[model samples]
Target chain A: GGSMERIKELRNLMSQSRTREILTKTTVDHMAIIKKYT
Target chain B: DEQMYQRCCNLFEKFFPSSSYRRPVGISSMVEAMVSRARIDARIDFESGRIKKEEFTEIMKICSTIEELRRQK
Candidate 1:
């Protein structure tokens, strides 16, 4: 029932820049996978 | 379960038209995880009354975009 609170806490715990870096790396890795298949 | 799986497949085709392509094992698992996570989050938000029906739909759309971008090569 408190999932929202947990999500907010997690978000607060992680820096914005760190989240951005993770997302960037994830996107890059996904692109690499697509390249391998295509 | 079938509907969720079908939605995932449909999203893939929408993002990539070429049916001849196949994703790597790591990439496939990552995509599945993202979809599952999004679904769970959306559900939680809905049950908690944190988001309206329209917002839930919007969240799904955002999820689709994320998957599509991640699939791009």
Candidate 2:
């Protein structure tokens, strides 16, 4: 199904270095704020 | 919602044309739902002062970039 294929593509993309970098960077930045406040 | 639908449809047409016989309602709805959830979470964080406006904007930009990359040529 098209939906299945799209899900597969998203899964693959999430595994890529670029995707990982963005997620990590965003999460880390958010964490820094949390650390500062708490 | 329109942009989310278009993005979902474009991904199907680009990478899965062979299986594009079905309507994209479910696919687009799923995409929209996920995106909306991410947006709401980010907005809530910003509103609660857990994250700055700049951080929220940057996260939103990343979300847009990720969506665009789904259909990247």
Q: Best-fitting candidate, measured by lDDT?
A: 2
lDDT of 2 at B6: 40
The C-alpha local distance difference test score for the whole of candidate 1 amounts to 0.46
- The CAPRI-style docking tier of model 1 reads incorrect
lDDT of 2 by residue, B1-73 (tens): 2343344334434432446353323323333334444566678878988777776776677557656654442
Question: What is each candidate's DockQ, to 2 decimals?
Answer: 0.05, 0.04
TM-score of chain A of each: 0.35, 0.46
Best by DockQ: 1
Off by over 4 Å in 2: A1-38, B1-33
Native contacts retained, all candidates in order? 0.01, 0.03
TM-score of 2: 0.37
* Cα lDDT, all candidates: 0.46, 0.46
